[PDB]
Amino acid sequence: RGSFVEMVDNLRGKSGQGYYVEMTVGSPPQTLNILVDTGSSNFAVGAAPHPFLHRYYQRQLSSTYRDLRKGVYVPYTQGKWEGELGTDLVSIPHGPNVTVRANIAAITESDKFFINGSNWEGILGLAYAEIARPDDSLEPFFDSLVKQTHVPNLFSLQLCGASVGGSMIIGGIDHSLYTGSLWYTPIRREWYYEVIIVRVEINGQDLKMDCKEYNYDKSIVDSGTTNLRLPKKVFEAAVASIKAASSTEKFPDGFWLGEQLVCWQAGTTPWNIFPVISLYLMGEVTNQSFRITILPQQYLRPVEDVATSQDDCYKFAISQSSTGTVMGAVIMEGFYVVFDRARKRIGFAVSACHVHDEFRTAAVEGPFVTLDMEDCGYN
Numbered sequence: 152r153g154s155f156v157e158m159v160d161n162l163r164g165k166s167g168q169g170y171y172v173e174m175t176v177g178s179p180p181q182t183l184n185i186l187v188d189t190g191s192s193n194f195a196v197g198a199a200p201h202p203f204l205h206r207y208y209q210r211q212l213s214s215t216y217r218d219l220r221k222g223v224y225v226p227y228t229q230g231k232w233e234g235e236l237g238t239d240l241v242s243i244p245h246g247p248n249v250t251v252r253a254n255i256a257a258i259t260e261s262d263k264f265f266i267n268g269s270n271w272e273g274i275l276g277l278a279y280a281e282i283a284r285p286d287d288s289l290e291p292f293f294d295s296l297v298k299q300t301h302v303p304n305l306f307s308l309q310l311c312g313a314s315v316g317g318s319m320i321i322g323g324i325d326h327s328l329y330t331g332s333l334w335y336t337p338i339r340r341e342w343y344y345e346v347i348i349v350r351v352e353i354n355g356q357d358l359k360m361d362c363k364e365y366n367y368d369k370s371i372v373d374s375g376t377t378n379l380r381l382p383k384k385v386f387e388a389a390v391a392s393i394k395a396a397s398s399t400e401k402f403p404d405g406f407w408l409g410e411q412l413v414c415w416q417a418g419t420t421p422w423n424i425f426p427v428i429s430l431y432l433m434g435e436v437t438n439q440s441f442r443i444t445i446l447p448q449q450y451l452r453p454v455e456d457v458a459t460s461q462d463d464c465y466k467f468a469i470s471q472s473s474t475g476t477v478m479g480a481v482i483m484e485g486f487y488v489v490f491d492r493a494r495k496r497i498g499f500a501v502s503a504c505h506v507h508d509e510f511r512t513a514a515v516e517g518p519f520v521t522l523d524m525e526d527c528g529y530n
């Protein structure tokens with residue numbers, strides 16, 4: 152408990168392309184890099200020579216592969232993949248010293264799913280069976296891991312933004328990865344890691360919306376999405392408020408919509424004109440909340456691959472959503488996040504690796520008194 156040196160720094164990535172862990176599949180073991188995704192629940196790996204893939208699962212080479220004789224077709228808003236379901240032996244080399252028999256979707260066809268240039272070739276869905284495809288009888292990886300071993304039913308993620316890196320501690324927490332205290336919010340329902348946001352402030356100024364708007368139709372914590380995505384009506388109020396707070400510089404409207412980049416002369420980003428963003432989350436106790444605060448260093452994302460420019464260019468990474476709030480890597484890179492599935496709750500603490508400056512830091516503070524927090528959930 153509390154110290155897992157073998158798992159520290161077991162994540163890698165590049166800006167824009169997410170965080171992956173090494174895994175092995177099959178006998179003898181085939182090494183693959185796998186995107187860590189708390190926003191889905193399938194373990195799905197490229198299993199054919201798509202041109203974007205460094206490596207892919209070759210079932211023919213595994214003596215322990217078992218075919219389930221069942222296909223799956225999985226479309227998302229953008230992107231889709233199709234695969235053939237089976238089971239095989241899976242390990243995490245920089246993870247617990249265990250091997251488990253897990254479901255795997257061998258991806259045989261995909262569109263807009265793999266990233267050209269990335270170094271990962273499958274996804275590890277860490278959420279619950281309820282959103283597994285094709286249905287909840289396909290047990291997710293982490294459920295198999297916990298049923299089949301003595302690994303405790305929890306994992307924690309420290310995502311260190313811009314090469315990016317970080318740690319996924321499987322079966323515990325490592326107290327060297329955060330400072331101050333962990334504060335916990337209840338998992339409202341086990342499907343996504345759904346939570347309830349009870350208040351939102353921009354530089355300490357409350358947006359004063361009906362709090363159900365913050366969770367319409369849900370709010371989730373999702374390592375497989377880059378942005379902080381907010382329900383449209385909340386996005387509108389938040390942007391209006393951020394524009395006001397930064398109004399000593401004027402930016403094109405398209406910037407706030409994520410339709411164009413903004414660039415400054417190198418080493419001169421005016422961090423201090425941009426406000427901090429605070430989300431208050433439902434706490435463990437009746438009428439008690441806590442708040443997490445992030446900086447422009449989290450929500451203004453560096454874009455380095457801008458071949459048509461010399462300067463430091465950034466994308467605004469808070470965007471409008473029609474699927475609820477998504478606390479993607481913009482939120483998670485401020486914090487050490489504990490997915491305490493055994494107690495159905497999510498812990499946040501200030502990350503020991505988060506990007507900040509001499510004036511401001513990411514923060515996790517409580518307790519606050521917040522009434523009617525159960526009305527903030529959408530049914």
Ligand SMILES: N#Cc1ccc(C(=O)Nc2ccc(F)c([C@]3(CF)C[C@@H](C(F)(F)F)OC(N)=N3)c2)nc1
Pocket residue numbers: 167168169170186188189190191192227228229230264265266274373374375376377480
């Ligand atoms: N930081 C960062 C960062 C950068 C890139 C990325 C990245 O490419 N993710 C990725 C790629 C294809 C994918 F199909 C998905 C999916 C898989 F289920 C669907 C996606 C949705 F539902 F939104 F389509 O939401 C989530 N949660 N997972 C995620 N992830 C994180």
Ligand code: NA
Pocket residue numbers: 296297298299300301302
């Ligand atoms: Na167990």
Ligand code: NA
Pocket residue numbers: 326327328329330331
């Ligand atoms: Na600590």
